[model samples]
Target: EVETFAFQAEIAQLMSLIINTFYSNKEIFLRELISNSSDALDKIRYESLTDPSKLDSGKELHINLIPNKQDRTLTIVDTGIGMTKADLINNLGTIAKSGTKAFMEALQAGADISMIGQFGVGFYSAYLVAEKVTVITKHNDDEQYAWESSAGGSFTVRTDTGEPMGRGTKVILHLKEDQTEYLEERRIKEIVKKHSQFIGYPITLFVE
Candidate 1:
């Protein structure tokens, strides 16, 4: 767990600001989440080759996109290392290390800040075009939980039966009226290949 916990109020606000302002390329969220999942699967595989029985290695890793036009929601589900309740808010609502602060700090301290996005807050970029975001995650150590937010004033967390699919996560983004382009399969595949071509996992869709 590494002494992990929630973020400060300032961090929460900063997260909303960064996500809302910085990620105008809305479709990239799918790529980022899927890429993160692939990384997790790769790590588990590497660990398993040595220990063999250390983690959950019997299951496969995959990413699936399910779009419901009636719901106007694009659902991205993955089987990976799901995060805890604390992990959800801390990572998604309040990012670790302010990218803006770090940028200027680097300038003042005469350091290079060229790769700011590599900081691991890539998943929070989904807020750019989502009217509402719902995350249902089941972790190895914790009971399943759901985190919902509108990137507005308040957020909510509740226990979930979640999905009995596997040890992973399901994130559904209720797309904004203007960002409906993300609901298309061709667009989604193009974005994934562009950003996640090296993902090393099967990515599929349940729609159409």
Candidate 2:
């Protein structure tokens, strides 16, 4: 159940822009990640209304940020609906196919953007700071798997036999040299409170 896939022609171009053009302001990456987490948690919460036995047994949803200075990694873990292999491929690789060309045109035109993830490209923003990105996710409908990317137009996915995660996604960011500021406890909480205070679920930091 491990596979390798190439990015669609349009997605590769858009990712290049996200990695290079969007470097001026990097703190926004945290906001985008947290926003995406909130959306995932909400989706699963809604599903639980129809099936009470959904993952986590309907417990309160939460997001945890764990920063490891030794490894230069920042991990964002959430209790929510994780993605299947197909979901990971489509969501992360294709960029909605049809909208990709327009998204590129808008960016090339310098259009004022109000929000991220509007075109499903917000996830790539992780590359703004990370040299590599890894996601380990478990979903109700499929086996747990790991997705790895260097934001270089291609990625690989492998089935993970690690302890069952129960249900959810864990995004690990391998910080670039200049992006180490994100690993500080103070800085992480500051960004979270400033941009994500209004988020419904608890956003907690696990500082070592």
Candidate 3:
């Protein structure tokens, strides 16, 4: 059974603030997300060097970027360190113990609004264009799980039978009407140019 959890207090406000403020530079949402997948790849790789078993999920590591025009969804798949159920709750759910509150406070204080070096803040950027977000992930130590949210009040997490992912995390963004620009091949390629250029890893994009 999948379980759902509500975001911390004032999370709804935080998400709305993100949407309105980040609307201009929303493209960077996909930009930093790839870095997250890359970071996860590094984690599994580094640990495998010591344990050797971490590579059992297969040593071939890469990010698969697929854009579906029919469904209007852009999926970012990473063969990296997948998240556990708890990881989903902690990492993607609450984000930071009152991190939303912190950001809310900063915005209210007329903060410089440059950018905060925090993972949760960037992750929420998916809501900038996506009506909903679905994350299906599998980790070496835990069964696969699917976590989904719509940037409303809460998100859901459930054990997923879809282990076809082997060991990795797949983030599917259901794009909104005006956000279709992200589904275009040229735009995505141009956006990820710096990331896929010298990351020493393959970023395969499939477009039909």
Candidate 4:
């Protein structure tokens, strides 16, 4: 039971600035989120040595991308540390991360992006090209939940109307018309292999 603050006026301005101006590429969202998944898997796996049962929820950590050029939707799903309803609100809507202030300062000072993997606001960069974003997550500890939003300030969190995921999170991005290159199979494979092939997780793309 944690409380989340609404975006402060200045923070809202910061979101507008970053979401509108920082990222020049939209495809990097997959790279960022998959990298985050790798990190989450590392966390839980390490924690499993002392608590073995914790590993049952996510035995095979992987990322799956289902891109639909017709429907204009891209889905990135991961079997990792799935969030609870409170986690959805805290991590998505407000600041639950520790390095937000430092991350912003570094961006302001023109820091190298090699640092983004360590302190990630990279997930939010999805808003740059997505008109709507939906996150469906399930945790072994609780019921499945869906969190959806348009970057227009408000977001909705509800019970996932779909099947209960045994464990994982899936992010569905409704792409803007101009960012359709992300829908291409070859482009996605090239990008994933370049940025994430050496990554320890198996990332699969289902494209048509």
Candidate 5:
């Protein structure tokens, strides 16, 4: 029952605002993404504690940072509570449920920029340094799906034909010409140490 759909007017506007204003440091994109991964992992882990059947057995909870210089891509992979087709639409497509419109309104009224991550649109920060973003995810209740966007105001989602991810999500960033610095292992490590070293989950960088 999953199909392509355009973002609502409010979400379209919110994406523009996030790209233009919320993030001043392009490197912070990595931090926000890792933080998101940590949150997802926490959710699944907590659910598993109360109900073992909530997630697949023996699923190791961790995050992977893979930088591919040859392809000019950076991928963040996480074993966590993943998004189903409907979850992707509600989460990545619209702004109403996330209160993103309210945050945008408050920002215009002189709110602190640091509050951006607190509101939920922090994922859009990927657009700060990437020309295109692709998310491949698999949820326990749904099949694998891929969502990709150029972050301009439109996005598409379809069933993923690749091997199943088992559980969790992966975010791949196609670096823009000037943002290629993110493709460096040292750079990624530094960013993670600065913003995510103390996170509850293990964050590993794979640079081959």
Candidate 6:
């Protein structure tokens, strides 16, 4: 079952702005995504030390990038802290409008995008390369859920129909063919090394 929700008006406008603005850096999407998964891994590990039960016992922390040449899709899997329904809604569905007042200006200066990162909109970077993005995640406190969007006016959140995915996130990108280099294993590994070398998580990319 799924419930559909509309994105804030400000969100769609800004999302389009970002997708077009980063036209030259479409590849940055991969780094932003990997960095997000790394952060999730760190969060889960950090919380596990305090609560012990906060981590997923099913797997050790890692990032798996599986490129499907068959489907022209790329899947990024993370054994990291997943999001609850509200977390999905809050994190992916909307932008931090007021807070971006500072970071937004920083965009005009084109000086610091790290500020946009602080507000969690870095996920929007996914749309730069993908025509559609599907995220399946299972959090310790919530059932597995799938979030889907096409950088459209709205995105959907639905319960995962398959068996439990354990505690983590799985993001699948249906490439916008202009993102030609992503499907190549070599190009992927090359970008991973350049942008996310210090992410503190083992990231493996392979064709499957």
Candidate that beats the other on TM-score, 3 or 4, i.e. the better one: 3
Better of 3 and 5 by lDDT: 5
- The whole-model lDDT of each prediction reads 0.67, 0.81, 0.79, 0.73, 0.82, 0.80
In model 1, the runs with Cα more than 4 Å from the true position are 1-7, 19-24, 46-58, 89-95, 98-116
Question: Over the stretch 1-208, how does candidate 3's per-residue lDDT look in tens digits?
Answer: 8787887756667677766674476676786577778888999999898899988877889999999999999999999998988888876545554666676677667662334325245567688789999999999978888999887778899888775678999999999999999999999998888434666568898985
> Model 6: how far is 50 from its true place, Å?
1.7
Poorest stretch of ten by lDDT in candidate 4: 1-10
- Tens-place lDDT per residue, model 1, 98-171, is 65466445535764322334555555566766778888877665777877776655567777764564467788
Please say which candidate is ahead in lDDT: 1 or 6. Answer: 6
Runs with alpha carbons beyond 4 Å of true place in candidate 2: 56-58, 91-95, 110-114
Query: Candidate 1: how many backbone clashes?
Result: 0
The 10-residue segment with the lowest total lDDT in model 6: 92-101
> Candidate 4, residue 112: CA error in Å?
6.9
RMSD of each: 4.9, 2.1, 2.5, 3.3, 2.3, 2.2
Q: Model 5 over residues 74-107: C-alpha lDDT tens digits?
A: 9999999988888878755554545676677778
Tell me the TM-score of each prediction against the true structure: 0.76, 0.90, 0.87, 0.85, 0.90, 0.90
Question: What is the alpha-carbon lDDT of model 1 when measured against the actual structure?
Answer: 0.67
Q: Which residue pairs overlap in candidate 4's backbone?
A: none
Once fitted onto the true fold, the runs of candidate 6 whose alpha carbons sit more than 4 angstroms away are 56-59, 91-95, 112-119
Q: Give candidate 4 misplaced runs (Cα > 4 Å).
A: 1-11, 91-98, 112-116
Clashing pairs in 6: none
User: On a 0 to 1 TM-score scale, where does candidate 5 land against the true structure?
Assistant: 0.90
